Design a protein around this ligand. Structure first.
Ligand SMILES: *[C@@H]1O[C@H](CO)[C@@H](O[C@@H]2O[C@H](CO)[C@@H](O[C@@H]3O[C@H](CO[C@H]4O[C@H](CO)[C@@H](O)[C@H](O[C@H]5O[C@H](CO)[C@@H](O)[C@H](O)[C@@H]5O[C@H]5O[C@H](CO)[C@@H](O)[C@H](O)[C@@H]5O)[C@@H]4O)[C@@H](O)[C@H](O[C@H]4O[C@H](CO)[C@@H](O)[C@H](O)[C@@H]4O[C@H]4O[C@H](CO)[C@@H](O)[C@H](O)[C@@H]4O)[C@@H]3O)[C@H](O)[C@H]2NC(C)=O)[C@H](O)[C@H]1NC(C)=O
Ligand code: XHL
Ligand code: XHL
Ligand code: CA
Ligand code: CL
Ligand code: NA
Ligand code: NA
Ligand code: ZN
Length: 805
């Protein structure tokens, strides 16, 4: 109940919200059915429209008009946005040449440049080029400010997950808004676009920018406009707030447009009907900028033009139906569309079987337009598993398609020609970023980056300390003319030991054999130098990684590779080696096929053993530095050390051997040498973070050898490929991956074929940022380069996507 008997006179769009049953005059009231009786009359005026005309100039203030052309309007702060253009001979902001904004040019009383976030729903990245002729205001912001060719949304590339990620810097798994539709079990409740449940605060985690601002004494306008408040009124309201007295005026503002998303669903991303909503968004930008110029704020305010996700062509006839795969299709609930999430229809049923459901959905049709996953097997780059609201069974749907349960769900719910929500690497899902103002750079292009990074920058722009988030603070410093954040390297927590020869062969009882009893003072001094780290500048190009947690580990040097060997996990945490363009691939000699050699620098008690692998009928093993790439027949013996061995499913060895035998050399040839760092990852609770020892759920049978959930590699070379990887003077180039360590290759439908037909495609799918690997390992890479730290941070957030142009 609301006693909606009070009034809004003089209170229109008040900034603080009064609590029921007092009636409300804030821009949120419409959504709660709690606006005072006179809200529309007083606060939502429309008379005479939104523009001044010649004959309105100098008029007698009529308070009934939507906006004013009277003489007192400037100081009343409520002129139509085009007032000075029509009634004072001034020019439109878009008509002026752009001039560099070297310093903030603000009215007296402004303690900091205001921030205005202009967010647009469904604004696909390629609209910037393809719609450029009809968006002159947006085009000026873009070319005169700082812009990226596109910005990467988060998965799922839905509206609510992405808007709330923009506001918090958090992955949907961490902020809790994991989709446009949700079921929570612990609450026991559902969340929908249509409805009032979405308004309960219990769904919304993290700390959004407006709360971060308020807690630190920076005032905020609202970030939530009611759907019925027209755009011209949102703009005029922001402009009025900007005329408030210094002690009442917000420092951060948001505008939101439901377009072009709304039209894109109906007409497809490039439907002829799309030109008009793009004209209209541009007009609104024009209005804001003319309005700022009027208030003399156009060289004072920082403006962010940002989208939530793009839009793809999707129609009803591109729908896969689960009723064509399953028989018990009535025993499940599907969250349908551009992604699938499956759970049991009823919690009282113990006859429900996820493994059988998955199996029934795997590679069943030659053309299948989706792939099922247990959520923990989804590519780690999606960061989409660590939330009770995310169902165990997930369907990644092909771009341009939908998944539905049964045909009845589609024709009794073609409506639509566009949709979004697909994997966030897909070109059609990419969106836009432009920054314009005194704090952003002038006429500057920046590389594509992820929307999780923006919260830190918005906080920097307002002098706020960001709440803990998934951005990497400093990775976007290159966007800004002046930075208040200078990042520093995390301190190394554990220092390594450097063991020498300490054990005799006969102390080892590991059940390993090698045919290596084959016998020179010249090359006896040589091998000693290699074990002391003579070749280390060759294979360790960027310094050793820093270990950022408490543990026990040894640095081990070899002719061809260096490693950091964990006495706790009984395997390297990391193995580093360089393969030059000219290097050669050899095979493993017949006599050294099953060879594993004790490492005399490392105690039997901290070594793996061959017997466990023999006893374990599921588990085999592989090597981190590949024997195939040894530099000499003598150096090859190094690759069979027990300290280079890691547990591998036979199914996984197919993937790993192909990467090591074929792909490393191909990358070296194409990139003019590569440096490779590889190692294990343990993430049994799928939270994206390194597991402690007591979290491991699987060991090689009858041993304390832990089984990795994933294997990573980081492959670095010179951005200037005319220079070899090992003699690079400038910026670096990186690609990385985190491969799931699986006992089958069910994920790859063509895995019965030669590795040359599927393995690389799998690896591409599991592309990763160096930063993802850092979280998963507790390691810190690139400690010793010539490059500035902000540049290294940008490099660590880079994702190689494998999409066309
Ligand atoms: C992306 O960035 C984010 C933010 O930096 C990273 O997430 C953080 O990771 C931290 C480590 O996992 C985590 O810290 C834990 O906090 C626990 C309490 O935290 C509450 O308060 C904070 C701060 O206000 C709040 O943010 C949290 O909000 C969560 O929960 C609410 C309501 O449930 C949700 O609405 C909200 O969305 C959010 O949910 C998300 O996080 C939780 C986990 O916290 C997930 O389960 C959800 O799925 C969802 O993703 C919290 O309300 C605190 O209790 C923990 O402490 C335990 O562990 C330490 C180890 O040092 C130990 O010392 C303690 O004693 C304690 O152990 C005890 O509890 C155990 C579990 O009950 C028990 O087993 C033991 O026996 C002990 O009794 C811990 O410190 C932090 O909360 C989140 N923050 C967020 C916002 O998610 C994220 O890691 C980054 N991602 C990547 C890939 O890097
Ligand atoms: C005390 C508390 O927690 N809250 C926060 C939530 C409400 C809001 N505060 N400020 C707003 O603009 C409004 N929600 N805005 C949003 C904008 C985008 C999105 Cl996806 C979701 C919400 C009421 C207060
Ligand atoms: C029902 C619900 O809660 N949502 C809120 C989100 C959408 C919005 N409706 N009105 C808004 O202004 C808009 N949020 N805008 C934002 C402005 C800035 C930023 Cl960073 C993020 C969002 C759809 C409805
Ligand atoms: Ca973990
Ligand atoms: Cl959804
Ligand atoms: Na075995
Ligand atoms: Na297969
Ligand atoms: Zn949409």
């Amino acid at each position: 109940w609301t006693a909606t008997s009070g009034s809004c006179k003089g209170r229109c769009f008040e900034l603080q919200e009064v609590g029921p049953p007092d009636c409300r005059c804030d821009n949120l009231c419409k959504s709660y059915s709690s606006c005072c009786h006179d809200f529309d009359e007083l606060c939502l005026k429309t008379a005479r429209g939104w523009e001044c005309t010649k004959d309105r100039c100098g008029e007698v203030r009529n308070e009934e008009n939507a906006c004013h052309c009277s003489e007192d309007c400037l100081s009343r702060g409520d002129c139509c946005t085009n007032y000075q253009v029509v009634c004072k001979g001034e020019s439109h902001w878009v008509d002026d040449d752009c001039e560099e904004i070297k310093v903030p040019e603000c009215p007296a009383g402004f303690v900091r440049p205001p921030l205005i976030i202009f967010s647009v729903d469904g604004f696909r990245a390629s609209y910037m080029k393809k719609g450029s002729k009809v968006m002159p205001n947006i085009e000026k912001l873009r070319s005169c400010g700082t812009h990226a060719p596109y910005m990467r949304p988060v998965y799922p590339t839905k509206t609510f997950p992405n808007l709330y990620t923009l506001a918090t810097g958090l992955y949907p798994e961490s902020h809790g808004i994991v989709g446009n539709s949700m079921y929570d079990p612990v609450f026991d409740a559902s969340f929908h676009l249509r409805g009032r449940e979405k308004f309960n605060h219990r769904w919304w985690g993290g700390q959004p920018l407006w709360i971060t601002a308020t807690k630190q004494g920076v005032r905020a306008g609202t970030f939530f406009w009611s759907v019925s408040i027209p755009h011209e009124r949102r703009i005029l309201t922001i402009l009025q707030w900007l005329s408030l007295p210094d002690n009442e005026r917000p420092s951060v503002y948001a505008f939101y447009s439901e377009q072009p998303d709304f039209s894109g669903h109906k007409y497809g991303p490039f439907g002829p009907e799309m030109t008009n909503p793009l004209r209209e968004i541009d007009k609104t930008v024009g209005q804001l900028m003319d309005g700022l110029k009027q208030l003399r704020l156009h060289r004072c305010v920082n403006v962010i033009f940002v989208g939530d996700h793009g839009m793809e062509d999707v129609t009803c006839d591109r729908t896969e139906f689960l009723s064509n795969y399953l028989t018990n299709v009535d025993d499940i609930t599907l969250v349908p569309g551009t992604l699938g999430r499956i759970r049991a229809k009823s919690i009282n049923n113990s006859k429900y079987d996820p493994k059988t459901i998955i199996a029934a959905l795997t590679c069943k049709k030659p053309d299948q337009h989706f792939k099922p996953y247990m959520k923990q097997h989804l590519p780690k780059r999606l960061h989409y598993a660590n939330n009770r609201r995310i169902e165990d069974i997930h369907l990644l749907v092909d771009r341009r398609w939908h998944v539905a349960r049964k045909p009845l769900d589609v024709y009794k719910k073609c409506f639509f020609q566009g949709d979004h929500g697909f994997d966030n690497k897909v070109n059609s899902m990419q969106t836009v970023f432009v920054g314009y103002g005194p704090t952003f750079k002038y006429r500057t292009k920046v590389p594509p980056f992820e929307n999780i990074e923006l919260y830190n920058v918005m906080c920097d722009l307002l002098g706020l300390k960001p709440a803990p988030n998934n951005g990497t603070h400093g990775s976007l410093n290159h966007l800004l003319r002046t930075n208040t954040f200078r990042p520093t390297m995390p301190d190394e927590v554990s220092r390594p030991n450097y063991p020498g020869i300490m054990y005799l062969q006969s102390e080892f009882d590991l059940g390993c054999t090698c045919d290596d009893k084959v016998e020179n003072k010249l090359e006896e001094l040589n091998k000693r130098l290699h074990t002391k780290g003579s070749t280390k500048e060759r294979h360790l190009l960027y310094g050793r990684p820093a270990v950022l947690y408490r543990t026990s580990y040894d640095i081990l040097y070899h002719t061809d590779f260096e490693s950091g060997y964990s006495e706790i996990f009984l395997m390297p945490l990391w193995t580093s080696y360089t393969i030059s363009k000219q290097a050669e691939v050899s095979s493993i000699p017949e006599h050294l096929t099953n060879c594993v050699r004790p490492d005399v620098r490392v105690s039997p008690g901290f070594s793996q053993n061959c017997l466990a692998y023999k006893n374990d009928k599921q588990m085999s093993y592989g090597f981190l530095f590949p024997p195939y790439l040894s530099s000499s027949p003598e150096a090859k013996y190094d690759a069979f050390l027990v300290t280079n061995m890691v547990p591998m499913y036979p199914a996984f060895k197919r993937v790993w051997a192909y990467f090591q035998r074929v792909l490393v050399k191909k990358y070296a040839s194409e990139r003019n040498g590569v440096n490779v760092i590889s190692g294990p990852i343990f993430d049994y609770n799928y939270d994206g973070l390194r597991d402690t020892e007591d979290e491991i759920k699987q060991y090689v049978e009858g041993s304390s050898i832990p089984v990795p959930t994933h294997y990573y590699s980081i492959i670095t070379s010179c951005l200037d490929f005319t220079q070899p990887a090992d003699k690079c003077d400038g910026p670096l180039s990186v690609s990385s991956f985190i491969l799931p360590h699986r006992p089958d290759n069910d994920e790859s439908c063509n895995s019965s074929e030669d590795e040359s037909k599927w393995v690389e495609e799998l690896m591409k799918m599991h592309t990763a940022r160096v930063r993802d690997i850092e979280h998963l390992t507790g390691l810190d890479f690139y400690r010793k380069t010539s490059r500035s730290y902000s540049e290294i941070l940008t490099l660590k957030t880079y994702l190689h996507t494998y999409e066309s142009e």
